[PDB]
């Protein structure tokens, strides 16, 4: 600390807990936040799982199938 | 058997008071109930930029030769604004006490504010402020207004914003001059060799034509530039005001305080009507700023709770040493009858502030200091290399202790 960096003309106001309200429009704005962080990264994070979704099924499916008893087999 | 300063109001409202003394020199002045708080951010340097036109000539004495009068007698002209009153003092002798007291008649009223000179009054003020920000403590005191008062017409400096300082005209000054020079907001105050009858008759002769929520608030303003070879930093909470008594005690209490690690360190307790700022304004290297303050707060948290009655006494002798302030000078007498006027309303002699001094012990210094310093939040103004400056979570934990 005072050797961290060294910075210029940044000034930084700023206000007591005990002046501002706690939660200041907390579900005002936060579901609009929450709701525009989601939108920016739903695209790279949802297909991974989506498709791995799929593959889980159809492994099981596929599986179930090929316990599945061969009718045409001892016959 | 101090003196008194015989008081005479005018039916305008002008309370005309003086002090006589052997000093064959006397200082009079004319003190105004205006200054930056009562501007509304429209006009925020019209006492100030006022205060440049004052003495650039009248209407009865156009330009310099008003000037050279105050020359001929060999008397010396001063005026100063702060964010509540605006002063205009001569000190003079006392043989030429009539035509001083015409001069600061001219000065109150009959002004001449002269378009060329508006410009040439803009240029100093536009580059004074365009180099003021060079005086730092100038700078951390202002920030530190700014900060606490944020919101109200405390916040804002007596300069004003250069926008302000480049827009203005003559007419908005002259709402100003008519709208905050009213008579029954003025005092005329004499100090020294004076007679109070003369001064009376001088004030009715001339100068009878005078026309007749505060918050504070907490906050972290850091204004870093590590460029600058030392810091500035200046912490206080909000203070009494000017009627308040116990402000006598919290002198006795900053006296106290004192000053004992980093350079600089220093203490003041200004008022404005019912508030005002109760602080500390140290300056130092990189890394005392935090001891210092470490250091500061829990000199302020010791007067809170083991506050002895060694160190009362020793405070209060500083405190009544320090009535020197009124000491017998025509001036600082002077100065102090003006304020004395427009703020208590009268002139509290020297014996009262002794009783009030002396009726002041240990057990109520720690009250009072519980009451004003304990457990409050700070408003703290940095300028200079003040990343090792704590921010307002350590600044406010120190302002209490655990045990």
Known sequence: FGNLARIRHVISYSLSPFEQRAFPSYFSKGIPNVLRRTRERILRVAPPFVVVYLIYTWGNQEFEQSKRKNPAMYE | ?403
């Not at chain 2, 001094?357 to 310093?373: G, P």
């Open chain 2, 1 to 403: 058997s101090v003196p008194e300063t015989q008081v005479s109001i005018l039916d305008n409202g002008l309370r005309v008071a003086s002090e006589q003394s052997s000093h064959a020199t006397c200082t009079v002045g004319v003190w105004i109930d205006a200054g930056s708080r009562y501007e509304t951010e429209k006009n925020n340097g019209a006492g100030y930029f006022l205060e440049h036109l004052a003495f650039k000539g009248t209407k009865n004495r156009p330009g310099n030769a008003l000037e050279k009068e105050v020359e001929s007698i060999g008397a010396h002209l001063n005026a100063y604004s702060t964010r509540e009153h605006t002063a205009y003092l001569i000190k003079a002798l006392s043989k030429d006490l009539p035509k001083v007291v015409e001069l600061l008649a001219d000065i109150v009223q009959n002004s001449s504010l002269e378009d060329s000179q508006i410009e040439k009054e803009r240029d100093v003020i536009l580059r004074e402020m365009q180099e003021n920000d060079a005086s730092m403590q100038n700078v951390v005191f202002d920030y530190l207004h700014a900060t606490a008062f944020q919101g109200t017409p405390l916040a804002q400096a007596v300069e004003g914003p250069s926008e302000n300082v480049r827009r203005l005209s003559r007419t908005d000054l002259t709402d100003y001059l008519n709208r905050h020079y009213k008579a029954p907001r003025m005092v005329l105050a004499a100090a020294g060799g004076v007679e109070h009858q003369q001064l009376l008759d001088l004030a009715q002769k001339h100068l009878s034509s005078v026309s007749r929520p505060c918050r504070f608030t907490g906050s972290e303003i850091r204004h870093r530039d590590d460029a600058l070879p030392l810091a500035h930093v200046a912490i206080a909470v909000e203070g009494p005001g000017w009627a308040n008594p116990d402000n006598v005690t919290l002198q006795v209490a900053n006296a106290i305080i004192g000053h004992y690690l980093c350079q600089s360190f220093q203490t003041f307790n200004i008022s404005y009507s019912d508030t005002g700022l109760l602080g500390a304004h140290f300056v130092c290297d990189a890394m005392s700023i935090d001891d210092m303050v470490f250091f500061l707060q829990g000199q302020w948290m010791r007067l809170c709770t083991s506050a002895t009655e060694s160190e009362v006494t020793r405070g209060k002798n500083i405190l009544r040493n320090a009535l020197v302030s009124h000491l017998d000078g025509t001036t600082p007498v002077c100065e102090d009858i003006g304020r004395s006027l427009l703020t208590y309303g009268r002139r509290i002699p020297l014996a009262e502030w002794e009783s009030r001094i002396q009726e002041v012990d240990a057990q109520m210094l720690r009250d009072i200091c519980s009451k004003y310093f304990y457990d409050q939040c700070p408003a703290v103004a940095g300028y200079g290399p003040i990343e090792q400056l704590p921010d307002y979570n350590r600044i406010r934990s120190g302002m209490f202790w655990l045990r």
